[PDB]
Design a binder for this molecule. Structure first.
Ligand SMILES: O=P(O)(O)O[C@H]1O[C@H](CF)[C@@H](O)[C@H](O)[C@H]1O
Ligand SMILES: [Mg+2]
Length: 448
């Protein structure tokens, strides 16, 4: 009935039955009709099928009279950056994120790298592609190759004071995705000693598809940090718009705590700024932002909502617990590079370990981590939870699912916009025992 590849925030599907060169050319034609005037920026990740999908995208765009700026093999944040930097009408990143090997996809943005989502253009594109039986026209526009990263690289380096940086030893783990190319281009401008793990891009993924959240991939970075006495370690997903931190003990840092740490880091530079955060886990961020002089701003989870709220608020920084970090100067877009530059600067400047920068906060606001439930009836399961806790009279907020605040503990429970899942997050005021008993209680009710 509808094309499955078109999801709430991007396109993704198995090649070639859900996504192929014909659909990609048709997407290019339909994208040309949705955008304002200007050229379109295209880039792609390390997957084997990605270049051919970009070529068809370009073929459909140029047949519709759009100039194409091919920035080549890149990270997703480079499409965002170059789209805004070159004042393009739009951009497309061909990337499969971390879906299986036979999969690929696309992330589409319009002017200033504003996201194009299901309800803001993507389903309009889908419907056009679905009905398009027109003969493929011929290109009436040019393609320029623009692989110079100087402006991008300079913008990354502008977030830190290079004269304050220490020669930290940093484990870097590209997972054979694309992040290692950017690390190597930054390295002549930085004092750090890099320990490079799974560094070379390989779309065949000899060491697994890049996903630092899976414990086996987690351990490769952790062991490299411990084995080398590194100050900390960093891992990326394949298109490296997500980054993941490992302290000097090898412990993976739960992304929740990076939001408050990056907020204080940014607020030191831009006093009194607003900081956008999501509703899943809040107490630590609210406190760290306020203590650093900032103003926290609650916002629905999801990069489209985060970006739009950041724009309306002139917020300097936005952070999600799911390893997405957004920066006003970066076209309000997410970066997998800016966050570790900022953390390295903080470690260099404060003389404190990454471990110690987060340890007191992890003690003060222990959290469950996101816990996903595939249930027979999401709506019924949520009702069993709320009915159980009704007699306690929690403070309820519906910005994003249901947030219930009981005083010493709170939870958020939502349905995913990208998967038919229920997602659960719990945190407490310095009480690990209460965190475990309440998490287990909620889990049993959801599973019921
Ligand atoms: O939880 P979801 O499935 O609805 O959304 C997930 O993908 C979004 C886009 F990448 C993120 O912005 C959310 O923070 C993340 O949680
Ligand atoms: Mg990614």
């Amino acid at each position: 009935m509808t094309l499955p590849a078109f999801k709430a925030y991007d396109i993704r599907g198995r090649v070639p039955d859900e996504l192929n060169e014909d659909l990609a050319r048709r997407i290019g034609v339909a994208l040309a009709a949705q955008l304002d005037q200007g050229p379109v920026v295209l880039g792609h990740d390390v997957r084997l099928a990605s270049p051919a999908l970009q070529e068809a995208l370009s073929a459909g765009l140029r047949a519709s009279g759009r100039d194409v700026i091919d920035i080549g093999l890149c990270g997703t944040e480079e499409v965002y950056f170059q789209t805004d930097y070159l004042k393009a009408a739009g951009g497309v990143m061909v990337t499969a994120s971390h879906n299986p090997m036979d999969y690929n996809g696309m992330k589409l943005v319009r002017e200033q790298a504003r996201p194009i989502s299901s309800d803001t253009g993507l389903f309009a594109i889908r419907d056009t592609v679905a009905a398009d039986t027109a003969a493929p026209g011929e290109p009436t526009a040019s393609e320029q190759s623009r692989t110079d990263k100087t402006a991008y690289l300079e913008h990354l380096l502008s977030y830190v004071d290079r004269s304050t940086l220490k020669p930290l030893k940093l484990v870097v783990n590209a997972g054979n995705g694309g992040a290692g190319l950017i690390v190597d281009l930054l390295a002549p401008h930085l004092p750090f000693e890099f320990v490079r793990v799974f560094h070379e891009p390989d779309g065949n993924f000899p060491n697994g598809i890049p996903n630092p959240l899976l414990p086996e991939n987690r351990d490769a970075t952790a062991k490299a940090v411990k084995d080398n006495g590194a100050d900390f370690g960093i891992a990326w997903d394949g298109d490296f718009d997500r980054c993941f931190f490992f302290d000097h003990t090898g412990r993976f840092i739960e992304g929740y705590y990076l939001v408050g740490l990056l907020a204080q880091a940014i607020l030191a530079k831009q006093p009194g700024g607003k900081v956008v955060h999501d509703p899943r886990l809040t107490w630590n961020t609210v406190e760290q932002v306020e203590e650093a002089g900032g103003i926290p701003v609650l916002c629905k989870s999801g990069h489209a909502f985060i970006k739009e709220k950041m724009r309306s608020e002139n917020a300097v920084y936005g952070g999600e617990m799911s390893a997405h970090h957004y920066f006003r100067e970066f076209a309000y877009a997410d970066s997998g590079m800016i966050p570790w530059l900022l953390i390295a600067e903080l470690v260099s400047q404060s003389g404190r370990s990454l471990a110690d920068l987060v340890e007191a906060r992890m003690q003060k606001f222990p959290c469950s981590g996101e816990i996903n439930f595939k249930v027979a009836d999401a709506k019924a399961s949520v009702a069993r939870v709320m009915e159980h806790y009704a007699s306690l009279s929690p403070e309820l907020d519906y910005t994003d699912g249901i947030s219930a605040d009981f005083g010493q503990w709170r939870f958020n429970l939502r349905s995913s916009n990208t998967e038919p899942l229920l997602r659960l997050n719990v945190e407490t005021r310095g009480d690990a025992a209460l965190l475990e008993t309440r998490t287990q209680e909620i889990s049993n009710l959801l599973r019921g």
